[PDB]
Design a protein around this nucleic acid. Structure first.
Ligand SMILES: C[C@@]1(F)[C@H](O)[C@@H](COP(=O)(O)OP(=O)(O)OP(=O)(O)O)O[C@H]1n1cnc2c(=O)[nH]c(N)nc21
Ligand SMILES: C[C@@]1(F)[C@H](O)[C@@H](COP(=O)(O)OP(=O)(O)OP(=O)(O)O)O[C@H]1n1cnc2c(=O)[nH]c(N)nc21
Ligand SMILES: [Mg+2]
Ligand SMILES: [Mg+2]
Ligand SMILES: [Mg+2]
Ligand SMILES: [Zn+2]
Ligand SMILES: [Zn+2]
Lengths: 926, 72, 150, 154
RNA sequence: GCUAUGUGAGAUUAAGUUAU
RNA sequence: CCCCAUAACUUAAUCUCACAUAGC
């Protein structure tokens, strides 16, 4: 009817075009943040009331202005009228119009909301948090409107990859001011509610993409001045979007206006605590949990995470030159040094060293080692550097020249290649071809590989979700014993590796382990628990075979860091490597039936098993700066007796300073690492494992919450979803009962082999089909908004049949073979990798095969399971290696008869070209 | 044949590195880009072209004598 | 028959103490070597620390630490404010056109009078050879060394 | 009845085992000395060995472009820059005598590396751009014969 | 009991080497 | 200049345990 349209637009002079048909309602499929006694989650539902009416401009062009006329019961209508009349004067409330219109004989009460956008903040956060490259129409439309793109940006191939086309960081950032205005408007709304006495729960789906608020159905009226808005779910689900769109970029300008110039900020100023408090009180005014700008004042690890995400959000406003070690001019023997006297973290705030000696007369070995590892004397006594080759912050150039390091090509073993060719290998059309080589690099290699930390962005996490993910991960990390150990009990393998910078200039780590007595090491470790010691880490180019042209660099962390980290973390990290049958499979050998043991361990009791895996693209350089902190906190939870709160916090601060916010020395100059783990700290593998358990438990959590609870048939998992939403966004303390629960649920329906950065998942098929456990799409969506990377489908694999093992775990393929009278799983590698290792070696001594029958026994040990592969070319490499070993031995004997007269008392060399020696290493008897 | 090209390119780059081509950064970058491209090639016709381009870096400059290396 | 002590204690037990006596001698020699290594590394780190304090330029660093309220300043501003030499690495001629100039440019306030330009080969680069026409004929991780002009 | 061939079973194993350790130590020393001689010989003759290996694989390739470039470089035409592959970019190649000229450049074409290159600037030893004239059978006293031909790819 | 010798099983300890 | 961690092989010693034999 036309009269209904005329009644919808009353006093306001608006030209409306129906968005449906007639006076009937309009069905939309939008995301909702719902919490009832029947359903509770953040999923997409069908809303079937609401007669939408799009407004067209004077020139008959449709704009983003809709008049949603909700139809509901009379009681809700008259209650919402009263609440709106109480909240009429707020500038963040959508213009409501209440009228009754006769539809078919019954005057249905109508609640008309004027000039609100098509989508809400719930839709935006769902699109950016449940991203699917196929079904991304809502995100595409949101980008087309509120002009960010031109509807042609989506014609690009990888327009969302965050690695390919890194310009997706903008196009998103253009929504930052919209989100910031929404935050200001919700703060205004909360102020109005508190000053008017209405108590209610704020939800994202009740705020459009302009900041206006509506739906006052679930609002109760109390005494004026005593309103209690609930902003847990709203802010918590909004947190990950506050950093993708960079909402707090307007706060870097003079009057917080995007047109005005930037604020200058004193170069010397480093505190930034009052500014952080002002930002919190402006944007998160009604977040009832206490926020500490400096994490040193936190209670136990929970304000650490909670206030750390706020700090990482707020630190994007402050200049990047104020984050780093805080130096102070101390006087030793009357000579003024410049040494660190604290640290200013982007997450931990300002941390000050507790033991300071302004006036010193003599420096011991511990003090000399601490001062020599500090970057203060190196950066201060160095020329200023402006390195335009990278976007990372450049501090200083220690030396007056820039060092360019090139990678030498590998050496060619022509004898082995000729032997292989003589044995019918490397033929046109053969399934086994050389694909692993020693790729060489030019001078601009180390710096080019270092300039991949640009993929690491300041990521703000969902604390109301992360604070439960951490509990589930801690449950996964139970049955382990850890704590602090003395220098007597520290086990170090291969003492003389590097000793780190600047300690490379005087010797290896053996020198610093022998020069420092046990009491000296204990004193240094105790000093770490009360002070912050920043260290310099050197980047070194790897020299190893690979199938990709990408260069690889390894971070050589200073010995001053490794010595303390070992004493901190070798009580753990060794029970993890000595525990068999757990989720983490670090330390479990693949020989003597180990592969079969782990595979049957994770097959467990899943009802409808499939297999699933991933590779975490751009790891070690896209890891969020918060998830590494969470990892270090999880590994530090085995310290409730040995360490106090202050000691644990200072150890965490030391680890962040010398691992996370470390000063990377690439070439001959010092840079600043934006974040991410270090490849060579003390816990890279275990930190990666705990980070992998996270974002998988998170994937399960937000795949179980994003399911329509009304469509779930089972009454147990539905109640589990309800209680999970309760424990996430409505409960403050840890519910240990429901942490043991849902962990039993994961172990029953989601079994994992969590090795460092590598995982194999045996999950229930029918639960993933109904969206009750994590899947490939859910894991990809999780990585999109909590890793700043897009995980390609080609990097993932799945298996619908368990008679064939994982498609690829630890670069080893799995096949089911008959060993004796029982079927076992044997890991066989890529034959191209073994052939390339046999052909391309690192040095020229290794080209002489006679000098090394060894390393060929070792390559044949790993290549034995290929002999049972159905492919003949795959099976022939083992025989090739055995024949080459025999040839090497016989030509060594010939050389000994030519050079010498005496042969060799051998007869223990024949086992090395017989299949029995290598077969015995896969039979489970040793 | 790729097995005979992707290996002789490695040998050529090793020889060039041995006779101090890394001193000239431009030449080293060009001859390392060619070597990496040969190692990732998929058609022998376009791999022999890059093999030719990787050669004539040793032959252009009279560092290594050539007449005696071909006595066979 | 009763001469066991003549070869089981006069030739074996009298040799048993020699074994751990000798390993104790080796242990004390290795401990002396470790102490010497400790002394030499101590004297090396002390010399390093006492050597790179003379380069601190203790006339513009004392002027910025004293200006601090608590006495602490970020480390990342010490080179920006006190260093008398600037090294700029230029990957392409466009960067040189934008982020550099002729004999004088300006980075982090200041005024940096260029003293020399050098290439990846680290031999030399003349200031008149850096042009769009001559750019391809140059190795282009160019290092520009400039001095603060005051 | 014992202690005649019986006592010489534990004392006979004494000197025999001692000889066994002596032989074992001698063999270990011999193999260590061998593993050194060979390793140091390898690392001494690296350049010549790598060059010979390279030029053996080059003939085992049995190509045409490589077999033309190397044949020219034996006793004549060698390039001055990296051979370009795109249809653009120039290639300068010395021509050290008349025969190398006539084997390669015949007239506006250049052969070389299994392609045919069109010549652009036949500059002499010093710099005199020689027009295609005295480079004929008539006594060519074209300066020092290195007639660097600059040539573009067709 | 007493040394003497070999034996195998480890375990321990470094060194070399591969794989992840 | 050349990282952390795990597994495996190979060599070489050691502390023995245990077994066996011989002499006393
Ligand atoms: C998505 C919604 F469910 C809102 O949330 C609800 C208004 O809020 P409501 O009080 O009716 O919500 P509910 O019934 O749960 O209580 O209209 C629905 N809707 C339908 N089309 C539109 C549209 O174009 N824009 C907006 N912003 N919302 C629209
Ligand atoms: C680089 C890492 F820190 C990553 O945390 C993780 C896997 O990272 P990775 O390299 O497999 O993945 P990558 O980022 O390349 O992924 P793509 O680019 O292919 O997408 O183990 C580490 N790691 C890998 N090799 C080494 C090594 O030798 N030494 C040490 N100490 N650590 C290593
Ligand atoms: Mg609503
Ligand atoms: Mg409602
Ligand atoms: Mg990876
Ligand atoms: Zn706190
Ligand atoms: Zn502790």
């Amino acid at each position: 009817a036309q009269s209904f349209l005329n009644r919808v637009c009353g006093v306001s002079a608006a030209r409306l075009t129906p968005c449906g048909t007639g006076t009937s309602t309009d069905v939309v499929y939008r995301a909702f943040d719902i919490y009832n006694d029947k359903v509770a989650g953040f999923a997409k539902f069908l809303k079937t009331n609401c007669c939408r009416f799009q407004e067209k401009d004077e020139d008959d062009n449709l704009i983003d202005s809709y008049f949603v006329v909700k139809r509901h019961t009379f009681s809700n209508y008259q209650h919402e009228e009263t609440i709106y009349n109480l909240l009429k004067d707020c500038p963040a409330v959508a213009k409501h119009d209440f009228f009754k219109f006769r539809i078919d004989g019954d005057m249905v009460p109508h609640i008309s909301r004027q000039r609100l956008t098509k989508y809400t903040m719930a839709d935006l956060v769902y699109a950016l948090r449940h991203f699917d490259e196929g079904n991304c129409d809502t995100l595409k439309e949101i980008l087309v409107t509120y002009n960010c793109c031109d509807d042609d940006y989506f014609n690009k191939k990888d327009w969302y990859d965050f690695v390919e086309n890194p310009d997706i960081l903008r196009v998103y950032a253009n929504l930052g001011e919209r989100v910031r205005q929404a935050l200001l408007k919700t703060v205004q709304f909360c102020d109005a509610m508190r000053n008017a006495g209405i108590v209610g729960v704020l939800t994202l789906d009740n705020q459009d993409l302009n900041g206006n608020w509506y739906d006052f159905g679930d609002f109760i009226q109390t005494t004026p001045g005593s309103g209690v808005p609930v902003v847990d779910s709203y802010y918590s689900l909004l947190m990950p979007i506050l950093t993708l769109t960079r909402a707090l970029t307007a706060e870097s300008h003079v009057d917080t206006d995007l047109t005005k110039p930037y604020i200058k900020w004193d170069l010397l100023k480093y505190d930034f605590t009052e500014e952080r408090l002002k930002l919190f009180d402006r944007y998160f005014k009604y977040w009832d949990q206490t926020y500490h700008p400096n994490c040193v004042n936190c209670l136990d690890d929970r304000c650490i995470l909670h206030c750390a995400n706020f700090n990482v959000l707020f630190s994007t406003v402050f200049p990047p030159t104020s984050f780093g070690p805080l130096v102070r001019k101390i006087f030793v023997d009357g000579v003024p040094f410049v040494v660190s006297t604290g640290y200013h973290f982007r997450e931990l705030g300002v941390v000050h060293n507790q033991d300071v000696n302004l006036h010193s007369s003599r420096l011991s070995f511990k003090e000399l080692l601490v001062y020599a590892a500090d970057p203060a004397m190196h950066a201060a006594s160095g020329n200023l550097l402006l390195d335009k080759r990278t976007t990372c912050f450049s501090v200083a150039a220690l030396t007056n020249n820039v060092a360019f390091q090139t990678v030498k090509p590998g050496n060619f073993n022509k004898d082995f290649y000729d032997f292989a060719v003589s044995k019918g290998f490397f033929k046109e059309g053969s399934s086994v071809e050389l694909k692993h080589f020693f790729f060489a690099q030019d001078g601009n290699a180390a710096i080019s590989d270092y300039d991949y930390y640009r993929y690491n962005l300041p990521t703000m996490c969902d604390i109301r979700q992360l604070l439960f993910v951490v509990e589930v991960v801690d449950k996964y990390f139970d049955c382990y014993d850890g704590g602090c150990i003395n220098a007597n009990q520290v086990i170090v393998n291969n003492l003389d590796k590097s000793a780190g910078f600047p300690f490379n200039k005087w010797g290896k780590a053996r020198l610093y382990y022998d020069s420092m007595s046990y009491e000296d090491q204990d004193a240094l470790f105790a000093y770490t628990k009360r002070n912050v010691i920043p260290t310099i880490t050197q980047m070194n180019l790897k020299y190893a075979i690979s199938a990709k042209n990408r260069a690889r660099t390894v971070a050589g962390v200073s010995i001053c860091s490794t010595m303390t980290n070992r004493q901190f973390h070798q009580k753990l990290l060794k029970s993890i490597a000595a525990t068999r049958g757990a989720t983490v499979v670090i330390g479990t050998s693949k020989f003597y039936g180990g592969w079969h043991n782990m595979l049957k361990t994770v097959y467990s009791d899943v009802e409808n098993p499939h297999l699933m895996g991933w590779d975490y693209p751009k790891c070690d350089r896209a890891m969020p700066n918060m998830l590494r902190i969470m990892a270090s906190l999880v590994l530090a939870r085995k310290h409730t007796t040995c360490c106090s709160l202050s000691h644990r916090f200072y150890r965490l601060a030391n680890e962040c300073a010398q691992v996370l916010s470390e000063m990377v020395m690439c070439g001959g100059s010092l840079y600043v690492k934006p974040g991410g783990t270090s490849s060579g700290d003390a816990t890279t593998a275990y930190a990666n494992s705990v980070f992998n358990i996270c974002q998988a438990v998170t994937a399960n959590v937000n795949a179980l919450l994003s399911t329509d609870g009304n469509k779930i048939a089972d009454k147990y998992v539905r109640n589990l979803q309800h209680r999970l939403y309760e424990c996430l966004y409505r409960n403050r303390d840890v519910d240990t009962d429901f942490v043991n629960e849902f962990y039993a649920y994961l172990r029953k329906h989601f079994s994992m082999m969590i090795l460092s950065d590598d995982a194999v998942v045996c999950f229930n098929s029918t639960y993933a089909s109904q969206g009750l456990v994590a899947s490939i799409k859910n894991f990809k969506s999780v990585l999109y908004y909590q890793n700043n990377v897009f995980m390609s489908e080609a990097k993932c694999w799945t298996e619908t049949d368990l008679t064939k093992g994982p498609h690829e775990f630890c670069s080893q393929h799995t096949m089911l073979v008959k060993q004796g009278d029982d079927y076992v799983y044997l890991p066989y590698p890529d034959p191209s990798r073994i052939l390339g290792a046999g052909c391309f070696v690192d040095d020229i001594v290794k080209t002489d095969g006679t000098l090394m029958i060894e390393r060929f026994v070792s390559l044949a040990i790993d290549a034995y399971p290929l002999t049972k592969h159905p492919n003949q070319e795959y099976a022939d490499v083992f025989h090739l290696y055995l024949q080459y070993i025999r040839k090497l031995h016989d030509e060594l004997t010939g050389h000994m008869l030519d050079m010498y007269s005496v042969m060799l008392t051998n007869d223990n060399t024949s086992r090395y070209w017989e299949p029995e020696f290598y077969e015995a290493m896969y039979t489970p008897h040793t | 044949k790729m097995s005979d090209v992707k290996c002789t390119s490695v040998v050529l780059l090793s020889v060039l590195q041995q006779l101090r081509v890394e001193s000239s950064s431009k030449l080293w970058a060009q001859c390392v880009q060619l070597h990496n491209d040969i190692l990732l090639a998929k058609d022998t016709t376009e791999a022999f072209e890059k093999m030719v381009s990787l050669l004539s870096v040793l032959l252009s400059m009279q560092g290594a004598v050539d007449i005696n290396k071909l006595c066979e | 028959n009763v001469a066991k002590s003549e070869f089981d204690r006069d030739a074996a037990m009298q040799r048993k103490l020699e074994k751990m006596a000798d390993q104790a001698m080796t242990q004390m020699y290795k401990q002396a070597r470790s102490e010497d290594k400790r002394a030499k590394v101590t004297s090396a780190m002390q010399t390093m620390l006492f050597t790179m304090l003379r380069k601190l330029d203790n006339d513009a660093l004392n002027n910025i630490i004293n200006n601090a309220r608590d006495g602490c300043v970020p480390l990342n501003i010490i080179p920006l404010t006190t260093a008398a030499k600037l090294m700029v690495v230029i990957p392409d001629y466009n960067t040189y056109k934008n982020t550099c100039d002729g004999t004088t440019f300006t980075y982090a306030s200041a005024l940096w009078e260029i003293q020399q330009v050098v290439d990846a080969d680290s031999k030399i680069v003349q200031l008149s050879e850096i042009s769009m026409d001559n750019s391809p004929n140059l190795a282009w991780p160019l290092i520009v060394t400039a001095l603060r002009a005051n």
